[PDB]
RNA sequence: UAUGCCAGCUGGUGGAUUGCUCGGCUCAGGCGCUGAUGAAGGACGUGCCAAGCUGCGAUAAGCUGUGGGGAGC
RNA sequence: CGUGGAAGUCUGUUAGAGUUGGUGUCCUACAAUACCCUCUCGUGAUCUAUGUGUAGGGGUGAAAGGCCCAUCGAGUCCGGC
RNA sequence: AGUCGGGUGAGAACCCCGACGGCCUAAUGGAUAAGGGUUCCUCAGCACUGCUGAUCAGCUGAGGGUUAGCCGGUCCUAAGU
RNA sequence: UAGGGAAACGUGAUUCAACCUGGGGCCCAUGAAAAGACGAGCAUGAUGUCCGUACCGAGAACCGACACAGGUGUCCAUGGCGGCGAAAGCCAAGGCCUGUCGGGAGCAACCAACGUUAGGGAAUUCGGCAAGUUAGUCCCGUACCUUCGGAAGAAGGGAUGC
RNA sequence: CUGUCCCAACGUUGGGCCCGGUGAACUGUACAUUCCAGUGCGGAGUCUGGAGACACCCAGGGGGAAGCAAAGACCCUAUGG
């Protein structure tokens, strides 16, 4: 939720 | 055979550190079968029991270094870790100072020497850090 | 109406106090004092008590360590009960 | 802590309360205490 | 300082007693009010209808 | 009974900070291979011990003179420091 | 013929199924207020041995009377 | 020249507070925010215990929509359902 | 961070004694607040719990243990209720 | 001619936590209140009830679902060497071997922390990230700029043990 | 200034590996020794054609199972918030 899985 | 509980009783009986009793290894039985603190005094009492010697660091080494420095060695530029002001505190210093140059020139004004006036003169000079030490003081009281 | 005195406590620490300082340990109302403690006491086993140490035990009620005068016997007046 | 009278005759009870199931009551019931109660474990009241 | 595990250390403050009036451990012994019977605000027994079904 | 020289080179296979107690062991397997006895068997006078843990736990010499004696109904050897 | 596949047999694991009902669910008739004479509720007690439940209240699984009941408890 | 000892002053793993990098270790963890090293502050707008006040479209906010018991661009519980 | 002897035991790498070797120094020592609530001591145990085992235990069972005119509470008043 | 110690059962000194008592300075900040005590003697006697009191206080007794590497207040800040130091390192007193599974292989690859690497010396890389260099104390000496305070430990050079 | 790099080597400690004891989880439509091509809802261990293929087991680094984990946050849509 936060660009790369999940930052 | 558990004699933990002993080994408290004991610790508090002998009144030692808990590590320091000794329990002589050929009566442990006996040790086990002491219950009271009775029973444990009197096995104290035949030995069996023991408080083992508290050592202290040895000061001798440190004495020697410290005859040395007394003496002005092992102080060089290479053995000062702290800074100046840190090994002679200078207010201090000053205040060690100003006094004995107080002191001096109270004495040689009751013993006569100065008048209260020569005294007055020098005594503002002194609290105006004009002498180094009291000999550079009577040096200078010397014309 | 609740009774001062519920009956003694026989253990042996409660004997030792006993046998060695003339005291008799009791489980007593715990809604009575030292005092009240005293008299019932006295008036149940004819005797002069001296002082009386109270605490509220873990068990709910309140226990009293009776010290008696010198002129009674504790080991003797617990024997006859 | 510092316990009142009344917390301690409490807590004196929740103490008994965590006793066994008599040996008899076994037997006289031709055959568990549902209230028992670890001091670590469990947590009481207050 | 994370809000969960580290954060419940400091958490050793006593509120919520056996309340004297229903015998619950909800007297906030701070507040002096019970959460659970409203002893200590209210005369009257804490009680509200949607403490069950509307029909009910 | 006899005086043997124990190398305790093979300790050094074992971390440092241990070599102490492998160094103890390698004794009481070479005591067991050459009296014909069972480890089990090899009892080593704290005189071993002590020598063997003499500079600490992790400075253990690379030899150790050690006699010891075969006996018994079983077969078991007892040694010591020399 | 190892590792192994499929189905069965003996034993197990599991607790479905069948049978059973000291509990529920719903309908119906009767009846219907308690409390400062301190209720309802709760706490803590109370047993020879007593943790739970029930009962009871320092007269504590109970005390009294009247009636019923009956050789047991 | 000395005295004096000021400062949201300096150095400082004193205590204590903080949390920059390693994008290290961990990532069915020791841990639902940890470990190690590195790093910042450390007499002040300082840090901290306990007690106390402010309550949900409301508080609190040196303001990040931050925080209000692992819950926040409107807490939690039950109800409306 | 143990090792060699030995003790107890049906059973011992880890329960106990000694020696040797180490670890902790604002703490891994001493006294305590909160909080826990019997965990304290003793005896008897190992079905449960214990990162392996256990004869050991904060585990299981039964007993026991907390004594105050002069330490606290209690009294006073604080923010505030 | 209490107590305690097997015994001796000291005397002086320095620096001096505790405790006592003064002086100075600061505020666009002014640093509680009440009960109580004193003021106000002495003897003898009586009374002094009620509640808490065990233990832990933490890398197993608390919060974190756990015997959780986390979190959690106060006092001991004067034990010795060291040194500026409540610093490091080492060592007492006291505590502990329970930050609780062990045995074996010179113990391979691979991984975590880490030591040392010749010549070269940032060519690596988004970037010197990571690591390294420097270092304590004394002497000499110190640029631009500047709000004249600072810059500044600028830089640079020398010294250092017994 | 230096193993950041040329360009890697050797070493130290804890693992890794073997043995005793303790002992989970993720995941699982079924079948399953695959490989090269082809085909197919156009990104196949399973279809088609060929090739290869004796079983079982240990260790490894992770190529594939459009691997495991999450009813896509992007985008549109809903007479949604
Ligand atoms: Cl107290
Ligand atoms: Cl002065
Ligand atoms: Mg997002
Ligand atoms: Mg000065
Ligand atoms: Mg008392
Ligand atoms: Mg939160
Ligand atoms: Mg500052
Ligand atoms: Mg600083
Ligand atoms: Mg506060
Ligand atoms: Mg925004
Ligand atoms: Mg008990
Ligand atoms: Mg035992
Ligand atoms: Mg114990
Ligand atoms: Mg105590
Ligand atoms: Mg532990
Ligand atoms: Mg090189
Ligand atoms: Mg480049
Ligand atoms: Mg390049
Ligand atoms: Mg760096
Ligand atoms: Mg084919
Ligand atoms: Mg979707
Ligand atoms: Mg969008
Ligand atoms: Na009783
Ligand atoms: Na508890
Ligand atoms: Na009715
Ligand atoms: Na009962
Ligand atoms: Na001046
Ligand atoms: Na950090
Ligand atoms: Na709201
Ligand atoms: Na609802
Ligand atoms: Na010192
Ligand atoms: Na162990
Ligand atoms: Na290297
Ligand atoms: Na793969």
Not at chain 2, 30 to 41: F, G, N
Not at chain 2, 54 to 59: E, I, L, P, Q, Y
Not at chain 2, 87 to 107: F, H, Y
Not at chain 6, 41 to 53: F, G, H, K, T, Y
Request: proline share 2%.
């Amino acid at each position: 939720x936060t660009x790369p899985f999940x930052x | 055979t558990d004699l933990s509980a002993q080994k408290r009783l004991a610790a508090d009986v002998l009144d030692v550190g808990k590590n320091r009793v000794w329990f002589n290894p050929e009566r442990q039985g006996d040790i086990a079968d002491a219950i009271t603190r009775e029973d444990v005094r009197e096995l104290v009492d035949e030995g069996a029991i023991q408080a083992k010697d508290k050592k202290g660091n040895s000061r001798g080494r440190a004495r020697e270094r410290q005859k040395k420095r007394a003496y002005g060695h092992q102080k060089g530029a290479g053995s000062r870790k702290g800074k100046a002001g840190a090994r002679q505190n200078s207010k201090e210093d000053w205040e060690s100072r100003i006094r004995a140059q107080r002191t001096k020139l109270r004495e040689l004004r009751d013993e006569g020497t100065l008048s209260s006036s020569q005294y007055r003169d020098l005594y503002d000079k002194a609290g105006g850090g004009e002498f180094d030490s009291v000999a550079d003081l009577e040096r200078y009281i010397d014309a | 109406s609740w009774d001062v005195i519920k009956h003694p406590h026989v253990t042996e620490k409660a004997m030792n106090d006993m046998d060695f300082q003339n005291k008799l340990q009791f489980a007593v109302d715990d809604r009575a004092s030292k005092g009240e403690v005293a008299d019932a006491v006295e008036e149940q086993y004819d005797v002069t008590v001296e002082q009386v140490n109270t605490q509220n035990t873990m068990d709910g009620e309140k226990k009293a360590v009776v010290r008696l005068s010198e002129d009674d016997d504790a080991q003797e007046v617990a024997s006859r009960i | 802590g510092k316990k009142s009278k009344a917390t301690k005759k409490r807590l004196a009870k929740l103490d008994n309360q965590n006793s066994r199931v008599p040996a008899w009551v076994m037997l006289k019931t031709d055959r568990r205490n549902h209230k028992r109660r670890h001091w670590r474990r469990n947590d009481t009241d207050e | 300082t994370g809000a969960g595990t580290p954060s419940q250390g400091k958490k050793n403050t006593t509120t919520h007693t056996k309340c004297r009036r229903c015998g619950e451990k909800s007297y906030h012994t701070k507040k002096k009010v019970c959460s659970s019977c409203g002893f200590g605000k209210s005369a009257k027994r804490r009680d509200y209808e949607w403490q069950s079904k509307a029909g009910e | 009974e006899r005086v043997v020289t124990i190398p305790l080179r093979d300790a050094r296979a074992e971390p440092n900070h241990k070599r102490a107690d492998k160094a103890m062991i390698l004794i009481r397997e070479h005591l067991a291979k050459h009296f014909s006895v069972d480890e089990d068997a090899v009892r080593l006078d704290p005189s071993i011990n002590e020598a063997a843990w003499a500079r600490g736990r992790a400075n253990t010499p690379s030899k150790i003179r050690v006699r010891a004696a075969r006996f018994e109904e079983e077969g078991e050897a007892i040694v010591e420091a020399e």
